[PDB]
Each structure stands twice: as C-alpha cells, then as structure tokens.
Amino acid sequence: TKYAEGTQPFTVLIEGNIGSGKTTYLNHFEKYKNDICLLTEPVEKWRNVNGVDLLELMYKDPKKWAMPFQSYVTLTMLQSHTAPTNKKLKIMERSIFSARYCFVENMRRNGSLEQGMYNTLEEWYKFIEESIHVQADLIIYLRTSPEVAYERIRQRVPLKYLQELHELHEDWLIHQCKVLVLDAD
Amino acid sequence: TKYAEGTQPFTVLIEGNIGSGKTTYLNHFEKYKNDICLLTEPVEKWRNVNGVDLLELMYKDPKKWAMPFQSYVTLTMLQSHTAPTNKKLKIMERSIFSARYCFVENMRRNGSLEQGMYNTLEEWYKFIEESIHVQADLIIYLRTSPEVAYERIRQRVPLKYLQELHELHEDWLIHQRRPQSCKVLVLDAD
Numbered sequence A: 001t002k003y004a005e006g007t008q009p010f011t012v013l014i015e016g017n018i019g020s021g022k023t024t025y026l027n028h029f030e031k032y033k034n035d036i037c038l039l040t041e042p043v044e045k046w047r048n049v050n051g052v053d054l055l056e057l058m059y060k061d062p063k064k065w066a067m068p069f070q071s072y073v074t075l076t077m078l079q080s081h082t083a084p085t086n087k088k089l090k091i092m093e094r095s096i097f098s099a100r101y102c103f104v105e106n107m108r109r110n111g112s113l114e115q116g117m118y119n120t121l122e123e124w125y126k127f128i129e130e131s132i133h134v135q136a137d138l139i140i141y142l143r144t145s146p147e148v149a150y151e152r153i154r155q156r157v158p159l160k161y162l163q164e165l166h167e168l169h170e171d172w173l174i175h176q177c178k179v180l181v182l183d184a185d
Numbered sequence B: 001t002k003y004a005e006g007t008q009p010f011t012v013l014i015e016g017n018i019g020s021g022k023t024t025y026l027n028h029f030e031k032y033k034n035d036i037c038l039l040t041e042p043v044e045k046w047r048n049v050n051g052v053d054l055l056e057l058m059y060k061d062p063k064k065w066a067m068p069f070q071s072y073v074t075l076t077m078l079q080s081h082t083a084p085t086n087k088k089l090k091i092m093e094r095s096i097f098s099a100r101y102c103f104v105e106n107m108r109r110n111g112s113l114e115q116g117m118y119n120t121l122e123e124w125y126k127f128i129e130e131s132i133h134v135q136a137d138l139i140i141y142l143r144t145s146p147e148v149a150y151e152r153i154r155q156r157v158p159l160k161y162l163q164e165l166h167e168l169h170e171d172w173l174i175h176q177r178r179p180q181s182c183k184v185l186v187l188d189a190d
Ligand SMILES: Cc1cn([C@H]2C[C@H](O)[C@@H](CO)O2)c(=O)[nH]c1=O
Pocket: A018, A041, A043, A070, A073, A094, A095, A098, A099, A100, A103, A104
C-alpha cells in the first residue's frame, strides 16, 4: 500500500506543449483558490535550488545537467502530487507523467541523457509507481500545432524541439485516466 | 504515514569502510538464510543497469557519472530497505545512510558532485525520509584503521580516499555528528 493513498481529492492534470497557454489557462481558476487546490508547474523551485538554477544549467549544458535537473523535476512533481489538501478538487499544471513520457524521453532521444542516465531515471519511475500514490482522474490536453506554440513563446527554444515535444504529447495523449482534448490555436 | 511502515522486522545494518571485511563478515550468516533476511550490498545492480555499468562509469569519470550513480545507489538501498519479508530478522550490508552521510558527502567535498548535483541528491534524501520508512534498529560498525583497510583491498583505490571515508564513518558512528537513528555497536576488525 502506497504513500499518500486515499489522501487526495479528484485531481485534474493540465498537459500541453511549451507555449500551449497553460499558465494563461490556469489563471482563470485563480478566483477559486478557497475551493480548489491549484498547483502551478514548480519552475520557481527549479530555478532556485538553494541558490542553484538547475533549469538554466540544463539549457546551458544538457549533457551534464539534464540528469540532475530531470531528477529534481521528478521530485518536485511528487511533492505536488502528494501535498496534502482539504479542498475537494486539485488541479496540477503538468505532472510526473509529462516529465517522464515527454521530456525525459525526448532528452534520451536527442542524446542529452546518456543511456546510463536515462536508465537511472527510469528505474526510479518504476520504483515510484510501486511506492508513491499519484492521483490522476482527468487530463486536460491543451492541444496545439507546434507553429502556434512557437508563435506564442515569441510574443512573451527551436521549433524542432517544440515539434518533438508535440509528437510525444500526441503519442501519449491521443494515439495512446480519461483525456479531454481542447483546441488552443 | 510512510511507505512500508510496520512491514519490516528487526533490522541490523552492517557499516564500515571499503575493505573493512563486511563481505567476509556477512558470509558467516549464510547458514541462517531460512531464518534471516540477508541482503548484501547491491553491487551487481550497480554494475548492470540494463547493461550499463554505473559503478565503472563513476570511477572512470566522476564529474559526470557520480550524480546518476549515487542516485541509483539511493534507489537500490530503498529497494532493500523496503523489500518485504517473512523472516524475523533482517541484515543489510550498508544502507541509505552510509550512501548519504559518507559517500555522497565525500563526493561533494572532493568536487565529484557539483553543488547543484549534491543539492538535488539532498533534496531527495529529505523527501525520502518524510515518505519512505527506513527500518533500522542496530548498526554494527566494522571499525578499522584506513591502512589495514587499504591492505585488505590489495590482497584481493587511493589510501587518501579510504582515509576520508574512514573519517566520515567516524563522524557519523562515533563522534555522533549526523542524525542518529538507533544504537551503534562497534567491532574491532583486528
Ligand atoms: C515538466 C518539465 C518541464 N520542463 C521545462 C520546459 C520549459 O522550458 C520549462 C517551463 O515548463 O520547464 C522540462 O524541461 N522538463 C520537464 O520534465
């Protein structure tokens, strides 16, 4: 019997490519804070790990920092997934799943994560599912074309990267809990 | 309430420097397999992670492989610490604790683990003790002088490394610098 079993309300995961308008989408839920546990992607944690900016170090030098960075992402995800709450609904931006199935996978594919590094991350994921409870009742997929995503980012990463991520999200969420697809172009 | 709470028997951890004679010591317990859950240090796992030898890659190029290797060590330790068993006594060679307090710490000190890497490992350890139950009722410390340890290895790593490790084991198990979890029982391997 897993950690945090039966301690979690109905949980909705917001999934989508970089620049699919997740942050904008989640701001619409702001006014229900008293009723909804609302956890945005923990970027602030990744950018300040006792002063160290793992996210930056990763984009700067992936062959070296992808492994610890992704490892840290996994941790922060679990921190959100298990964080206790009294509310009757929980909404999370991204998840341990997008981290594993899209980001880690893509990093392996383009050789940022070497085999041994990928294998370590994966061994953890396998242990994590046997030991920690990840509540997930509904995914909302903010589906977009990579080009529209690319555009949105410019008004505020290569298109090729966004394409790769998009394909991986599609493999996971379309081509295969219940997924619910929204058009955000 | 943590994972694997109340699923574990009395647990003894065998701790000591590289070459303190842990493997030899644990072989004496072999003949009680039916009565004792007896888990040796999972080196085999570290040497074959879907074909990859993490242990080797670590000694070959520490700045790059220490982080994943130690991360993997942590995992295998947890795998042992929580592995279910019907026996009334469990004996583990090394532990999540030696990994954290001695090996990871030393790797930070000599710059194998860079700050961000160390910090990630530590954040995990902190999350791990809030979420996973690590049963530990008694530590047996195979205490030795680094020189004797060094000698034992030759009959079968720099002396400076063994010295550093020894000092860290001593800080943890004798001088009680780190958080204690249970009673330490010291043996002289001489
Ligand atoms: C969840 C997740 C996000 N990200 C990134 C992509 C974006 O650059 C940034 C903000 O989400 O974080 C990863 O790199 N890996 C991950 O596993």
